[PDB]
Amino acid sequence: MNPPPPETSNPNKPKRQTNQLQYLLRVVLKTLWKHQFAWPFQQPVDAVKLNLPDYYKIIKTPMDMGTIKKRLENNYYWNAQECIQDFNTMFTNCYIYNKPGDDIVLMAEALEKLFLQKINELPTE
Ligand SMILES: O=c1cc(-c2ccc(O)c(O)c2)oc2c(O)c(O)ccc12
């Protein structure tokens, strides 16, 4: 069964736009999105569709790039570090739910390397 997906708006949470957050959307997310391994990570895990009834029994902080994209578009984040933490949660969820050597883990490992490559240098404010 599926829990509600992570929020992408929250009226009482303070919003912010920075050069780094704009970069995280325009270059980091939108480039990763096009990678041949991006497809599993473009939407919340649908445990009913994918037949993973234990996914949310194991993963208590779900995250995916579709949620991240919507948060960036909505200026949901205060700073770039908050957004980077969501990417890191997404990758670690994959490693936690699975095991070394699985096809999905190989995909996450490749995407994490590309992600780190792109966040190594960010614009200045
Ligand atoms: O973490 C994941 C794990 C799996 C997965 C699927 C079938 C299996 O037999 C298995 O052992 C693991 O599938 C995913 C997926 O399809 C996504 O879109 C995003 C994340 C995952």
Swiss-Prot record:
Domain Bromo, residue spans: 16-122
UniProt tissue specificity: Ubiquitously expressed.
Localization in the cell: Nucleus; Chromosome
Post-translational modifications reported in the UniProt record: Phosphorylation by CK2 disrupt the intramolecular binding between the bromo domain 2 and the NPS region and promotes binding between the NPS and the BID regions, leading to activate the protein and promote binding to acetylated histones. In absence of phosphorylation, BRD4 does not localize to p53/TP53 target gene promoters, phosphorylation promoting recruitment to p53/TP53 target promoters.
Family: Belongs to the BET family.
Subunit record text: Interacts with p53/TP53; the interaction is direct. Interacts (via CTD region) with CDK9 and CCNT1, acting as an associated component of P-TEFb complex. Interacts with RELA (when acetylated at 'Lys-310'). Interacts (via NET domain) with NSD3, CHD4, BICRA and ATAD5. The interaction with BICRA bridges BRD4 to the GBAF complex. Interacts (via NET domain) with JMJD6 (via JmjC and N-terminal domains); the interaction is stronger in presence of ssRNA and recruits JMJD6 on distal enhancers. Interacts with NSD3. Interacts with NIPBL. (Microbial infection) Interacts with bovine papillomavirus type 1 regulatory protein E2. This interactions may serve for the tethering of viral genomes to host mitotic chromosomes allowing successful partitioning of the viral genome during cell division.
Miscellaneous information on this protein: JQ1, a thieno-triazolo-1,4-diazepine derivative, and I-BET, a benzodiazepine derivative, have been tested on tumors with success. Treatment with GSK1210151A (I-BET151, a I-BET derivative) has strong effets on mixed lineage leukemia and promotes myeloid differentiation and leukemia stem-cell depletion.
Recorded disease: Cornelia de Lange syndrome 6: A form of Cornelia de Lange syndrome, a clinically heterogeneous developmental disorder associated with malformations affecting multiple systems. It is characterized by facial dysmorphisms, abnormal hands and feet, growth delay, cognitive retardation, hirsutism, gastroesophageal dysfunction and cardiac, ophthalmologic and genitourinary anomalies. CDLS6 inheritance is autosomal dominant. A chromosomal aberration involving BRD4 is found in a rare, aggressive, and lethal carcinoma arising in midline organs of young people. Translocation t(15;19)(q14;p13) with NUTM1 which produces a BRD4-NUTM1 fusion protein.
Domain notes: The NET domain mediates interaction with a number of chromatin proteins involved in transcription regulation (NSD3, JMJD6, CHD4, GLTSCR1 and ATAD5). The C-terminal (CTD) region mediates interaction and recruitment of CDK9 and CCNT1 subunits of the P-TEFb complex. It is also required for maintenance of higher-order chromatin structure.
Function per UniProt: Chromatin reader protein that recognizes and binds acetylated histones and plays a key role in transmission of epigenetic memory across cell divisions and transcription regulation. Remains associated with acetylated chromatin throughout the entire cell cycle and provides epigenetic memory for postmitotic G1 gene transcription by preserving acetylated chromatin status and maintaining high-order chromatin structure. During interphase, plays a key role in regulating the transcription of signal-inducible genes by associating with the P-TEFb complex and recruiting it to promoters.
Protein name: Bromodomain-containing protein 4
